[PDB]
Design a protein around this ligand. Sequence first.
Ligand SMILES: CCCCC[C@H](CN(O)CO)C(=O)NCNC(=O)c1cc2cccc(OC)c2o1
Ligand SMILES: [Zn+2]
Ligand SMILES: [Zn+2]
Length: 200
Amino acid sequence: AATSRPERVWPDGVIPFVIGGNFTGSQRAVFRQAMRHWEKHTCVTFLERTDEDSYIVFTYRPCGCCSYVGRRGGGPQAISIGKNCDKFGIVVHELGHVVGFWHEHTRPDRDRHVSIVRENIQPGQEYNFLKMEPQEVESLGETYDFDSIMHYARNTFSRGIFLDTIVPKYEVNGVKPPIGQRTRLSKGDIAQARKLYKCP
Ligand SMILES: CCCCC[C@H](CN(O)CO)C(=O)NCNC(=O)c1cc2cccc(OC)c2o1
Ligand SMILES: [Zn+2]
Ligand SMILES: [Zn+2]
């Protein structure tokens, strides 16, 4: 679910950043590691902000809302992190938003790959399962990626941990594909981000 909007692609793949107050040393170390993980597998690079107009700010905030997707432009933008959502893999996902990705399950073609089980969604959290409009996404010829760091888990916003809100439709390698990994950028994520940023 890469943005279709070229103004949201950070020019030259260089993203200035600031780390705000109220984090521990350890949380700040994880931020740098997550930024470096992006740097290792793509041409995207994070740079400590000096005088740039547009830049990201790591802000202490309760988990959930919101990390701006892609470059806002004309000023600072938030990448929001809190106590329960600050592990390496979560921050990598959040930087996925920064660089221009929405959630994989909101791809316009998602109904060919997953079922949404509405009845299992926590009340008032249904908006998290809305498809993006076709005009807002350009997937760049890349197939729907179950292993994506941007893909929800089977029971994300579920009323109970044993109930699925998202179910993949078909078996891949003879078994239903696992979703919701927060370990690393997937092969699919790397391929897609390289196209988005026109990496060499
Ligand atoms: C109101 C939308 C709730 C979004 C919450 C999620 C949390 N994560 O999954 C983080 O990984 C989120 O941040 N998704 C990505 N960002 C957005 O969807 C989003 C929309 C939006 C609209 C106006 C202003 C914003 O400022 C940060 C926005 O973020
Ligand atoms: Zn997200
Ligand atoms: Zn994808």
